[PDB]
Copies of this chain bind each other. A is one copy, B any other.
Amino acid sequence: ETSSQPALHILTTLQEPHDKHLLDRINEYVGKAATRLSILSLLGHVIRLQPSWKHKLSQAPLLPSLLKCLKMDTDVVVLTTGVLVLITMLPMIPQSGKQHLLDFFDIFGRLSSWCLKKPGHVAEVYLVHLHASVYALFHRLYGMYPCNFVSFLRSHYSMKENLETFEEVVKPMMEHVRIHPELVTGSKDHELDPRRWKRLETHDVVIECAKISLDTAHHFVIRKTEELLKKAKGPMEVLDRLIQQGADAHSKELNKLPLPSIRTLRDQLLLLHNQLLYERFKRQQHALRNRRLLRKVIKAAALEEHNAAMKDQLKLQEK
């Protein structure tokens, strides 16, 4: 009724049995339809602050209740709220992967297909927020369970009924993630071992996720990334050099000529740096060709060839 911060501070630091009563009442209000969005917002705000009971979320019925909501409901606001709540929870309860890995993956796939379908009965702004949440979920899952999540991606987006979902939604996300080192040193059950998750605090899970992450909906996540980071934190030259170096080198050769008519090592050092300047100029030219190619492919990307063929079919009203 209030969104009162001091009451939220009371709630974030409860203890037994009031601890149990809080999670029970949150779970009840997630079960019912009317209270669902309100209590999901409370859950998000409380969980953001790492409450005293942060490790009891891993086994309370509230986590299944949230996941059930995220797999059954269609309210985009409720779905977005719950997804962001879940993403916030994963570093706090990473052990729950061993229980609900398939539910996390089901939620990711379902809402990726949602981002693909885009029901217009709900606003485009809400769907962009939902896609940003799905992007955050992809990043969080790939960071926390790399081999498991890659296996899910391969097994779920190599299916013919989701390859379009893949290319249109998920494949752009793969541009923003490095190859996870646990794809060479890890295992599937190594990402569900409770000991590994206990050896890392909430921050360390997020740091590891960030180690493999990089940086229209992509415009939204870029803008929101820069904004929140502002809250968090405050070639011709090469050619011009190489011609001079060559003139000097020919001068050196002109100094050799009087001798038949230590300096050797300086001569070799300058000659070597001349080759580095050549290689640097080549790298700049290569980068320029590349930037030109990025431009060309951007302007070739727009493709309605299917619609053009369909218009050819209707053009056969020539018949």
Q: Which of A142, A183, A268, A272 has the most CB of B within 10 A?
A: A272
CB of A264 within 8 A of chain B?
A: yes
CB of A7 within 8 A of chain B?
A: no
Chain A interface residue count, Cβ-Cβ cutoff 8 angstroms: 98
List of B residues within 8 angstroms of A221 by Cβ: 91, 202-203, 206
Contact of A217 among B210, B269, B299 (CB under 8 A): B210
Is B174 within 8 A of A181, CB to CB? yes
Is A268 within 8 A of B266, CB to CB? yes
Give A252 to B269 CA distance when docked, in angstroms: 9
State the oligomeric state as a number of copies: 2
CB of A32 within 8 A of chain B?
A: no
Q: Which of A48, A153, A308 has the most CB of B within 10 A?
A: A308
Output the least CB separation between A100 and chain B (Å). 20
Secondary structure call for the A interface? helix
Output the least CB separation between A294 and chain B (Å). 7
Contact of A150 among B179, B268, B292 (CB under 8 A): B179
Is A276 within 8 A of B253, CB to CB? yes
Contact of A214 among B170, B174, B214, B294 (CB under 8 A): B214
Give A285 to B281 CA distance when docked, in angstroms: 11
Contact of A289 among B266, B290, B302, B311 (CB under 8 A): B290
CB of A216 within 8 A of chain B?
A: yes
CB of A265 within 8 A of chain B?
A: yes
CB of A33 within 8 A of chain B?
A: no
Apart from A216-B224, A317-B317, list 12 A-B contacts with CB within 8 A.
Answer: A157-B184, A163-B185, A202-B222, A216-B228, A219-B233, A252-B272, A262-B268, A282-B283, A289-B290, A293-B296, A304-B304, A307-B307
Q: Give A residues with C-beta under 8 Å from B.
A: 48-50, 91, 136, 142, 150, 153-154, 157-158, 163, 166, 170-171, 174-181, 183-185, 201-203, 206-207, 209-210, 212, 214, 216-225, 228-229, 231-233, 249, 252-254, 262, 264-266, 268-269, 271-273, 275-276, 278-280, 282-283, 285-287, 289-290, 292-294, 296-297, 299-308, 310-315, 317-318
Provide a sorted-by-A list of 19 A–B residue pairs whose CB atoms are within 8 angstroms.
Answer: A154-B184, A203-B223, A207-B218, A210-B290, A216-B228, A219-B233, A220-B232, A253-B276, A254-B273, A262-B265, A262-B268, A273-B275, A275-B279, A283-B285, A293-B296, A293-B297, A297-B300, A300-B300, A311-B311
